[PDB]
Amino acid sequence: EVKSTTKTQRIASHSHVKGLGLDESGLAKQAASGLVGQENAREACGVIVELIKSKKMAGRAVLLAGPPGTGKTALALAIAQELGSKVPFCPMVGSEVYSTEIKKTEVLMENFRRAIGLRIIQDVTLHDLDVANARTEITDKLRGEINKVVNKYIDQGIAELVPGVLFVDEVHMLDIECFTYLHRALESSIAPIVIFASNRGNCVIRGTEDITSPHGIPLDLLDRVMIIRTMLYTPQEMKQIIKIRAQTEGINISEEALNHLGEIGTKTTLRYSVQLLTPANLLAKINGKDSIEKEHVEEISELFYDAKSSAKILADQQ
Amino acid sequence: EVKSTTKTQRIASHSHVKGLGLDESGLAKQAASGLVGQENAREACGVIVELIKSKKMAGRAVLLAGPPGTGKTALALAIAQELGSKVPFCPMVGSEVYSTEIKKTEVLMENFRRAIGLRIKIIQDVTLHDLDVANATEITDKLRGEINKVVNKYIDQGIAELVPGVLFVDEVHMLDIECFTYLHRALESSIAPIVIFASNRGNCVIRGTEDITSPHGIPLDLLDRVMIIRTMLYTPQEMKQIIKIRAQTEGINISEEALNHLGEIGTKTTLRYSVQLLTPANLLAKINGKDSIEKEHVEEISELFYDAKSSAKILADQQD
Amino acid sequence: EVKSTTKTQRIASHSHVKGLGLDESGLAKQAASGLVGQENAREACGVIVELIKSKKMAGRAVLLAGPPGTGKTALALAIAQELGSKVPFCPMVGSEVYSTEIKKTEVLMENFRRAIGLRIQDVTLHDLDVANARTEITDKLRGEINKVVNKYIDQGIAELVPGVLFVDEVHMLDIECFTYLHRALESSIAPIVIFASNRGNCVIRGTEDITSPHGIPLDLLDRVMIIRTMLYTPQEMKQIIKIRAQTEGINISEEALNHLGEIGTKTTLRYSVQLLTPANLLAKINGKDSIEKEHVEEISELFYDAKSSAKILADQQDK
Amino acid sequence: IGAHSHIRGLGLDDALEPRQASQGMVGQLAARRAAGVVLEMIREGKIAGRAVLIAGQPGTGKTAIAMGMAQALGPDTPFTAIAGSEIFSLEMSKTEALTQAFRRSIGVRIHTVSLHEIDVINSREIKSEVREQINAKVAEWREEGKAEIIPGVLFIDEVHMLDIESFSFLNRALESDMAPVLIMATNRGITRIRGTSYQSPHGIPIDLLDRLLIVSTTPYSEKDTKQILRIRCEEEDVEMSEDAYTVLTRIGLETSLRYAIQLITAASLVCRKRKGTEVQVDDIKRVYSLFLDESRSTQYMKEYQDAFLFN
Amino acid sequence: IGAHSHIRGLGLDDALEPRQASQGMVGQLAARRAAGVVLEMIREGKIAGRAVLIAGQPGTGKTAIAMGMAQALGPDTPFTAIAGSEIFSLEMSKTEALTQAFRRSIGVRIHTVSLHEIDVINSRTEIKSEVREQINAKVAEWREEGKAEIIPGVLFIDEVHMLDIESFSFLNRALESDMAPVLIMATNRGITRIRGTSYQSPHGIPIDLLDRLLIVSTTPYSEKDTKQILRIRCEEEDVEMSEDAYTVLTRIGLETSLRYAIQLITAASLVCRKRKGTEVQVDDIKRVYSLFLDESRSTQYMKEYQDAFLFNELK
Amino acid sequence: GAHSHIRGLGLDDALEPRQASQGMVGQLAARRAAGVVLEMIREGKIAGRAVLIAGQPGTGKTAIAMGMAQALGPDTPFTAIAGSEIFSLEMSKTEALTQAFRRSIGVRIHTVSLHEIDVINSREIKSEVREQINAKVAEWREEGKAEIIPGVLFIDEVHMLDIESFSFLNRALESDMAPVLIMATNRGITRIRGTSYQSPHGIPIDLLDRLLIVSTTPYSEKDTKQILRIRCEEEDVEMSEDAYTVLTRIGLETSLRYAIQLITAASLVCRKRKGTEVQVDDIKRVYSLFLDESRSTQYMKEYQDAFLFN
Ligand SMILES: Nc1ncnc2c1ncn2[C@@H]1O[C@H](COP(=O)(O)OP(=O)(O)OP(=O)(O)O)[C@@H](O)[C@H]1O
Ligand SMILES: Nc1ncnc2c1ncn2[C@@H]1O[C@H](COP(=O)(O)OP(=O)(O)OP(=O)(O)O)[C@@H](O)[C@H]1O
Ligand SMILES: Nc1ncnc2c1ncn2[C@@H]1O[C@H](COP(=O)(O)OP(=O)(O)OP(=O)(O)O)[C@@H](O)[C@H]1O
Ligand SMILES: Nc1ncnc2c1ncn2[C@@H]1O[C@H](COP(=O)(O)OP(=O)(O)OP(=O)(O)O)[C@@H](O)[C@H]1O
Ligand SMILES: Nc1ncnc2c1ncn2[C@@H]1O[C@H](COP(=O)(O)OP(=O)(O)OP(=O)(O)O)[C@@H](O)[C@H]1O
């Protein structure tokens, strides 16, 4: 019957990402499958895709190391797209584990279950099955029931297990104990492909206080990790992505406005620029305008701020 | 029937403070109602008194900022006196909340209940805490609910009237972020006492924050609702004047030469230190078969006993 | 019936220590009772022995202070020997109290019980604890043994022999442990507590700010009698290594021993003594009756001392 | 009498342009216009997965703008303003404090009643089972059509006070379909995130910052300060001379607007105590000597501690 | 044998003037006189809401003065001396440790028995909260009857700077009681942080408690006073000693500590006993000094060692 | 497996290292010393001792530990864990270490580790369950139907352990069936976790004083090539000599881990274009695609430093 637990608000910004856009050989195209530029990282993800498909990602994980708004998430989603469409993708933030009412293990177990799917053609994730049985609370006793049901369906041949992609952003935020929980899960046969993301260099491993390691990841886990670098976009790659977003969302934008919106990206991040589209559109609609023009973008960019510049304003006043 | 829970040891040093000693207009007199000098802080307390009486202290608290032994407590007691006598006054120290056997909330709840009184119509003057002990195993919040229902029915009937007093919190920088949240919330109530803080510090880290410095160690949220009154150091004339009231109050005779020396000890240390020398100095005179305290007695007691600052200095110097 | 709980692996390195080797007067002999040199510390332990025997160690403890591998443990064992042969000796390390599954009090309680014996059957209070449990050694089970033991003493069938509790790495005990020791040290039937330190002033664990000598609270340190142990002369170094070689039934050339003595001067006596076993096996592999200089030199090159192995790394980490 | 009693809206025309003085709002033009664009987003339903940060120095109308937005959204729209430090309670979990703050900002139409009021009614921290029942109760009423869920405004001042544990709560909280519009305020630039060893603009985790519409309030001029004081006097029912307003604004600019406003009540009493009719300069001058501004309060304490250090 | 066995009172005359050598006390005149003024306050019932602080270097008779005051108050008056560090226990709450310390200093007359002994009697045959509550009601009945008399004694807290605000607040609540003993604390520390706080205060005591103190200072001993203390201690420990030896032991005492000098008496006598001797000679004191080290020599040697291996970290 | 090629220490009867034997290449001194340790395990002279292999990462510390376990017997239980592995959400540091120990202690019938016996009579494992198995194995042993065969427990990243866990190992090694504990680190003087004190390798002095400390020296161009050559054979990867020359250079310039990591990736790049064997262009391309932990960070430093200047 299915219900789909999927947190759509997350993947909403990447509605346009349909794959890696690589050619027959494995080289990236300037713009293809929704992706613009970032050719080298895309080509590297291509190898990761073939290694997952060739069962050669034996206990290995991935780290996309790059500045914010360089498509680390977009690439992790494209990896899931390339694994076959209807392969689970579970994006999460390292800080999610820190909750007062929910245990670290429970945040992680849910996100892992959200990243492993089933093909019955009905496409369900292990977490959708957990809520279906609950709609008291998702106990580990309820998990044991589903696991026995699922394992009998596989052996019979009615359903097949599809392990997806678990994307963990702000990796430096996970504590030593969480990494131990991931590493152990990463050793399993039916595990998803864990994809980390970092814009930081050497960090103290959370829970150690003294111990600095690359990206804040314990060396034991980091030895099993494959690093892919994502880089900053030029104002043109920027403009191209913004144009795709505008098109996707069904927003009309003048090339002049888009050029200015691209250079705002260079000054701030691509994420900031993309986010200005909605307010800029509403301002145009208020002004009784069909499309977003340069004035609208300029006005929105003046009224609203980016965390860096808004914090700077404060420090300067201080 | 009543019993009175009141910790008399505390207010004992202020037995002489009978009010603010202000004139009809609202200006302070050099010496009046037991108070000497500190005219500006006294005048400011006068405004606070009228604001409390005019129901204009809506959610507002008071901070008395000044050096130790400048009558911050004496003024907070005078405010309670001026609110009309038999108005509760509950002096406390921020560090009281830190107990191993008693919860922070329970230390605060008790002190708030000690600061809100009742007038039963001979007129009986009871505090909400006197009623708590009057009932009692142990003062549980279930027992508090019983008294609160009893008290609320007496008010609506008209047999008893609720008199909210003054809750004086000294060493404010000692309360933690969670205590301030408990005070602020209580300060929002209609039947709450007037909270009077006292500081002798500037900017402090708020306890429980480790990084966060704010004036007097009070969270800015609460500090925005606080009215600051400055207390200042007494002149050597004002000093001798206070010491003499204390001597008179305690029924102690002191020579003007001894009092002059006792005044200058105050200037060097604190007024509190000077006042405290009166009892030992008197006993030394009684031992020497003397009617009053003379300069020799004061000089001898000042040499035998020390003030924290100078006793700590002695050690540090011996150590160096 | 007995069983003996005794952790033999610990005292194994001191199998040769049979007493303090003091003369009738109380002066130490160059080599006697297994002990070599360290004459002054030995003479001071002699006084401690007489004070324990004269009931003059009233609430007092002992601290042996010297560099590592200067026989502080060997002396604490010799004190126990000199007290009366089958007198308990319980060597422990301050860090033992820090266990996840066992409470600090329980680590200390066990070691104290391991240090107080009964007398001919010679049993320790801890051997009696396990004899009953062979669920778990509860303090309710301890109360049963204590009543049984106290009735045997009053009857005259058994006599209580308080031994020596040796606590090494003292700076590792926390303020709360010292409070547990001090309180136990006040008892009449308590063992003689012997602390060991190679540290100067330390922060008392559990205080964070508070520095005191050897990391011992001043309250306890005032009840403590300090004996200094010193580094061995290269002549004394070779003498000790030879006793150890003899004890283990190992043949060693005087040339190899001389080199093994100088290794000790460079590292510690403990390091040198420990090279004997691998050096012997290398000789046995090479079909040799005794350890020669080559064997010692080879073992000293293959194996390292913590200081020099850590230095190797730090230097590689620089290049 | 409330502090934002005069604020009745954002004072903007159909084109979202601020009117300088309208709906109780004076100056603070760009931030007001920006707050208006945010309203259009709430109304069009384009605020999902986003929040607002009003970044500015104290007494720049961050709370006033948040208030104007809530008034502008509807007459019944639930507005809840809390301090970051208020969640650190003796009798309450940080999250339970925040849960209450959220349920206070979510209304139920029948007379509109907040989810929190419904909890208090079926209670005396609130029981986990009690909320679970009300959540099922309101789900039935909504699907029936007898009740309407009206999400309001939750304002968190001193936002830098929050730790990751509470920051993560807000993320989970905003995932709900009936989640209110979260407006947060701060006067802090880059600060460490509480509960972490990491620094971030406004002490907010980067994942949450990347989702914000950051509005910045600029400090007031002598003209705007006078107008706020003038408005506040009217609300507190205080008559004041023009020369006095001139002095009180100067005090306000040199100290704080909070302190200048705090003086009104006190100055009027000083005036009332001598007939007066209206507050004069000498009334403002006397009340300034009587009560201290926090800057003066600490400066005197520094002078004290420093003098005892030298002697 | 106790450390303060010789102390039989403060040894002052009717005019509260110290007698140089009387009632087991020697010198320390100023502190003894001030302790006498405090006694008059205890007796005149003018000590309510106050306590005593004896600030002075170690081995200056801070405990001895406190002991003297307890002896002078009465022959049966309960005296309890504890170290600050002693309340930090594995088997006990800081407050429960302090509760026991307080109830040890509060006596009940019949033979006089401390409230704490009454707790132990009606317990093990940490104390139960219900047990104390019963005894508190039991003693209240006996007192109102007239069959028992509550006699508050002396509680001495050495190393007071070891206490945290949690325990400092306990003392305030504890001193509120009508049967509360006279609290005398001691320290050798000046301005230190208050444990449990980020704030510094004289002697590490909260300002609210300092403002209620009667602060007394113990000055260090001269060669004459040191000899007299050792001479007294020998008599108590039953040790015969030569005059040339006393001369040496006092020098050791002044150069090291009085504690170390006293520590040597027991050991020196044994060295003497082991060779006949009859009385402790200089050679006995000299030998026992070489055998056992004072805490200063002990640490200097360890510093020299640790510092030499630190310079090795370079070569 | 990563150490699939390691079949022993590759030593002769005189405990002299063979340069290339039993899957082991170079690292001669460290190997000979490991052989001395074996003689002690066999002669029963290892009681109250433990091994430490101090050395930089990728110097065969784990490989030597594996070689010792292979040489001790074909059935000898070998368990290799990281120090950070005991810090678990679902497990006590000691319970994590108890499992690590019981995995290294075997029972002969087919050989089965004490830990397997726990898992069989279970689904953290119950304290009562272990207590029963400990009594069960005691009966089987005294009967003669079962033989207790202590193996090898390898704790890599040992500096990660705190005193609480260091004290556990001391108690653990007191047992008669205790396995030979082999610890490894690449750290010099460091603070002991859970303490305010510094010690070589971050190990308490009481445990250091009982250690047989071996040092692994870094590999030459020759030894590095030989390790990669061996690893290719295990991963079934054909490679050109010019490529091996490049991959060893990458290995020396970066890490052996990274150069090994590239093999799988380089072969796929080659497979995706026919190739037959991995060429230089394949190694070169795969190097540009995936970064080594140091290039990874240098780029993150360059980024943060550029935003600091602006
Ligand atoms: N190469 C690309 N081609 C097309 N769209 C892209 C590309 N890179 C990024 N985007 C889009 O630009 C936006 C920002 O990218 P993304 O969110 O994946 O970056 P990030 O590096 O993971 O950092 P962050 O999540 O903190 O903003 C999204 O809308 C994303 O889908
Ligand atoms: N203006 C005053 N007139 C008369 N008595 C005063 C005056 N100021 C202070 N006193 C008295 O002098 C003493 C010290 O004053 P008080 O205790 O109120 O000061 P404080 O500033 O609150 O500081 P602290 O409580 O730490 O000693 C008390 O006996 C008090 O009653
Ligand atoms: N004076 C001595 N005479 C004979 N054997 C000695 C002597 N001193 C030490 N030894 C022996 O040398 C070795 C090292 O001495 P010991 O272990 O007692 O020293 P330590 O100072 O306590 O330091 P550590 O325990 O940290 O190695 C042991 O085998 C011990 O028995
Ligand atoms: N003035 C004195 N008269 C007689 N005996 C004294 C005198 N001062 C000290 N003593 C004795 O000398 C010893 C040391 O005195 P005491 O223990 O009181 O010193 P202290 O200042 O309290 O230092 P601490 O207790 O920290 O060691 C004790 O045996 C004590 O009785
Ligand atoms: N001397 C050697 N002979 C054969 N193979 C070796 C040798 N040294 C290392 N290897 C192999 O190279 C790889 C790295 O070795 P290893 O993992 O043991 O290094 P390490 O020093 O333990 O460092 P780390 O485990 O921290 O990555 C493994 O596949 C290992 O089997």
Residue C199 sits at the vertex; the CA angle it makes with C194 and C200, to the nearest 5 degrees, is: 105
Phi, psi (degrees; rounded to nearest 5) at D151: -65, 135
Q: What would the two tokens of residue D9 be?
A: 């809206």
Supply B12's token pair. 């004992």
Sort strands B166-170 and B194-199 into parallel, antiparallel or unpaired: parallel
- Residue A12 has what DSSP assignment? G
- Cα D163-D169-D172 angle, rounded to 5 deg: 150
Beta bridge partners of C214: none
* Distance from chain centroid for Cα F302: 34
CA–CA distances in Å: residue B56 to residues B49, B59, B165, D265, D283: 10, 9, 16, 7, 18
Rounded to the nearest 5°, which phi and psi values hold at A97?
-65, -25
Are residue C15 and residue C84 in the same domain, yes or no? yes
Distance CA A225, CA A171 (A): 13
State the residue for tokens 């069962």: A55
Residue F215 has its nearest CB partner, among C307, C309, C317, at: C309
Q: Are residues C218 and C244 in the same domain?
A: no
Please count the other Cβ atoms lying within 10 Å of the Cβ belonging to residue A250.
Answer: 7
What is the rounded end-to-end Cα distance, in angstroms, of chain C? 63
Nearest CA to ligand 3 atom 20: C69
Residue ranges per domain, chain D? 1-220, 221-311
On whether both C3 and C139 belong to a single domain, the answer is yes
Q: Given an 8 Å threshold on Cβ–Cβ distance, is C278 in contact with F167?
A: no
Same domain, C94 and C35: yes
Residues B221 and B278 in one domain: no
Backbone angles phi, psi at E196, to 5 degrees: 90, -5
* CATH code for the part of the protein at D1-220: 3.40.50.300
Closest CA to E163 of A215, F147, B98: B98
Secondary structure class of B7 (helix, strand, coil): coil
In angstroms, the Cα distances linking A145 to A130, A139, A152 are 9, 10, 11
- Measure Cα distances from E244 to E248, E274, E278, E293, F220 in Å: 6, 20, 15, 21, 75
Q: Give the ligand with the smallest distance to the CA of A41.
A: 1
What is the phi/psi pair of residue A159, to 5°? -130, 150
Class of domain F220-310: mainly alpha
Kindly list the residues from chain B whose CB atom is less than 8 angstroms away from the CB atom of residue E173. Answer: 99
Token look-up 């630190």 returns: E310
* Core vs surface per residue B124-157: b (16+ CB within 10 A) or e: ebbbbbbbbeeeeeebeeeebeebeeebeebeee
**Ramachandran class of C207: left when φ > 0, alpha when ψ lies in -120 to 50, beta otherwise:** alpha
What is the C-alpha separation between E124 and C298, in angstroms, rounded? 64
E258-273 vs E282-291: helix axis angle to the nearest 10?
Answer: 110
Tell me the CATH architecture of domain F1-219. 3-Layer(aba) Sandwich (3.40)
Residue E241 pairs in a beta bridge with: E280
Asked if C286 and F186 come within 8 Å (Cβ–Cβ), the reply is: no
User: For residue C35, what are the β-bridge partners?
Assistant: C32
Asked if residue A196 lies in contact with residue A217, where contact means CB atoms within 8 angstroms, the answer is yes
The enclosing domain of C222 has a CATH number of: 3.40.50.300
Q: Do A259 and A182 share a domain, yes or no?
A: no
Which 164-193 residues of chain B touch chain D by CB within 8 A?
Answer: 177-182, 184
| Residue F309 buriedness (CB in 10 A; 0-12 / 13-18 / 19+) | exposed
* Contact assessment for residue C293 and residue C255, using Cβ atoms and an 8 Å cutoff: yes
**What gap in Å lies between CA F310 and CA F308, rounded to an integer?**
6
Integer Cα distance of E4 and E154 in angstroms: 15
Are C179 and E298 within 8 A, CB to CB? Answer: no
DSSP state letters, chain C: -------HHHHGGGTT--S--B-SSSPBPSEETTEES-HHHHHHHHHHHHHHHTT--TT-EEEEE--SSSSHHHHHHHHHHHHHSS--EEEEEGGGG--SSS-HHHHHHHHHHTSEEE----EEHHHHHHHHH-----HHHHHHHHHHHHHHHHHTS--EEE-EEEEESGGGSBHHHHHHHHHHHTSTT--EEEEEES--EEEPBTTSS-EEETT--HHHHTTEEEEE--PPPHHHHHHHHHHHHHHTT--B-HHHHHHHHHHHHHS-HHHHHHTHHHHHHHHHHTT-SSB-HHHHHHHHHHSB-HHHHHHHHHHHTT-
My answer on whether B117 and B226 are in the same domain is yes
Structural domains of chain B, count: 2
Of F3, F22, F28, F261, best ligand 5 pocket probe by most atoms within 8 Å of the beta carbon: F3
| CA–CA distances in Å: residue F119 to residues A303, D193, F111, F122, F130 | 63, 43, 15, 5, 10
Residue B2: other Cβ atoms inside 10 A: 12
Query: Which residues 6+ apart lie within 8 Å of A246 measured at CB?
Result: A252, A253, A258, A277, A292
Q: How far apart are the first and last CA of chain A?
A: 59
Beta carbons within 10 angstroms of residue C38's beta carbon: 26
Greatest Cα pair distance in chain C: 74
Q: List helix spans (H) across B100-219.
A: 104-113, 128-135, 141-157, 177-187
The bridge status of strand E112-114 relative to strand E154-158 is: unpaired
A37 & A160 share domain: yes
Same domain, C209 and C297: no
Q: Which of B196, B212, B234 is the last residue of a domain?
A: B234
Beta strand pairing call for B116-120 and B160-164: antiparallel
The distance of Cα B55 from the centroid of its chain, to the nearest Å, equals 23
Q: What would the two tokens of residue E297 be? A: 């020599």
User: Residue E174: which of B101, B175, B13, B3 has the closest Cα?
Assistant: B101
From CA A65, how far away is CA A231, in angstroms rounded? Answer: 9
CA-to-CA separations, E315 to E311, F55, F202, in angstroms, rounded: 7, 21, 22
∠E198-E200-E202 over CA atoms, to 5°? 155
Q: Looking at this protein, which amino acid is placed at residue F107?
A: V
Q: Which residue is listed with tokens 């202020």?
A: B14
SS3 content of chain E, % helix, strand, coil (to 5): 50, 20, 35
Residue A58's identity, in one-letter code, is A
Q: Would you call A196 exposed, middle or buried from its count of C-beta atoms within 10 A (0-12, 13-18, 19+)?
A: buried
Q: Give the DSSP letter string of F4-47.
A: TT--S--B-TT--B-SEETTEES-HHHHHHHHHHHHHHHTT--T
Matching residue, tokens 């500015």 = D56
Measured CA to CA, the distance from residue B22 to residue A75 in angstroms comes to 77
Write down the number of H helices and E strands in chain B: 14, 12
Q: At C253, which CATH number?
A: 1.10.8.60
What is the b/e burial string over F51-74, where b = at least 16 CB atoms within 10 angstroms of the residue's CB? Answer: bbbbbbbbbbbbbbbbbbbbbbee
**Dihedral pair phi/psi, residue F236, rounded to 5°:** 60, 50
Residues 57-76 in F contacting A (C-alpha not used; CB under 8 Å): 57
- Contact between A182 and A86 under an 8 Å Cβ cutoff? The reply is no
List the single residue in A170, A278, A311 with the smallest CB-CB distance to D202: A311
Q: Do chains C and E touch (3 or more CB pairs under 8 A)?
A: yes
Residues of D in contact with B104 (CB under 8 A): 90
Q: How far is CA C313 from CA C50, C248, C292, D95, F185, in A?
A: 49, 34, 30, 48, 10
Domain span including residue A223: 1-233
The token pair that represents F129 in the structure block: 């369950």
What are all long-range contacts of E90-93, with beta carbons under 8 Å and residues at least 24 apart?
E90/C103, E90/C104, E90/C105, E90/C108, E90/C176, E90/C177, E90/C179, E90/C180, E91/C105, E91/C180, E91/E126, E92/E126, E93/B100, E93/B101, E93/E126
Task: Give C57's contacts (C-beta < 8 A, 6+ positions apart).
Answer: C48, C51, C192
Amino acid at C102: I
Give me the numbers of helices (H) and strands (E) for chain A, helices first please: 14, 13
3-state secondary structure of D215: strand
Alpha carbons F124 and A148: distance in angstroms, whole number: 21
Closest Cα partner for D293 from E208, C78, B224?
Answer: B224
Q: What is the rounded distance in angstroms from the CA atom of residue F11 to the CA atom of residue F16?
A: 5
Query: What are residue B68's phi and psi, to 5 degrees?
Result: -60, 140
Find the DSSP H helices in A90-167.
104-113, 126-132, 140-156
Sign (positive or negative) of CA dihedral A32, A33, A34, A37: negative
Q: How many CB atoms lie within 10 A of CB B87?
A: 21
**CATH architecture under which domain D221-311 falls:** Orthogonal Bundle (1.10)
Using a CB-CB cut-off of 8 Å, the residues of chain D touching B40 are 289-290
HSE of B179, CA atoms in CB hemisphere, 13 A: 26
Secondary structure class of A136 (helix, strand, coil):
coil
Nearest CA among A225, A43, A228 for reference residue F295? A228
CB crowding E222-243: b at 16 or more within 10 Å, else e: eeebbbbbbebbbebeebebbe
From E52, E53, E54, E60, mutation site for ligand 4 pocket: most ligand atoms within 8 A of C-beta = E60
Contact status, residue E91 vs residue C180, Cβ threshold 8 Å: yes
Residues in chain D: 311
Kind plus residue range of the DSSP H or E element containing A43: helix A39-53
- Ligand 5 site-directed mutation target among F5, F27, F256, most atoms within 8 Å of CB: F256
Is C45 found in the same domain as C16? yes
Report DSSP letters for E42-69, one per residue.
Answer: HHTT--TT-EEEEEE-TTSSHHHHHHHH
Spatial CB neighbours of C25, under 8 Å, sequence gap ≥ 6? E274, E275
> Of E264, E260, E269, which is closest to residue E240 (Cα–Cα)?
E269
CB D265 within 8 A of CB B56: yes
Judge if A98 and A35 occupy the same domain. yes
Point out which residues pair with E187 in neighbouring strands.
E55
The CA distance from F72 to C184, in Å, is 48
Contact by Cβ (8 Å): E14, E33: no
Strand C123-124 with D21-22, pairing: unpaired
Dihedral angle, C-alpha E199, E201, E204, E205, nearest 10 °: -110
**Residue type present at position E103:** R
- Radius of gyration for chain F, computed over Cα atoms and rounded to the nearest angstrom: 22
Q: What would the DSSP string read from start to end of A184-213?
A: HHHTSTT--EEEEEES--EEEPBTTSS-EE
Q: Which residues contact A151 (CB under 8 A, 6 or more apart)?
A: none
- Give D52's strand partners: D183, D213
Q: Helices C293-302 and C254-266 meet at what angle, rounded to 10?
A: 30
Q: Where are the alpha helices (DSSP H) in E146-222?
A: 165-175, 207-210
A193 backbone dihedrals φ, ψ, rounded to 5°? -85, 115
How is domain E222-315 classified at the architecture level of CATH?
Orthogonal Bundle (1.10)
Do B174 and B93 form a contact (C-beta atoms < 8 A)?
Answer: yes
Q: What is the distance, to the nearest Å, from the Cα of residue E311 to the centroid of all Cα atoms in its chain? A: 42
Asked if residue C57 and residue C183 are part of one domain, the reply reads yes
Nearest chain C Cα distance for residue F231, angstroms: 26
**Topology given in CATH for the domain delimited by E1-221:** Rossmann fold (3.40.50)
Question: At what resolution in Å was this solved?
Answer: 3.0
Among protein residues, the one with the nearest Cα to ligand 5's atom 7 is F60
Record: contact F290-A228, CB cut-off 8 A: yes
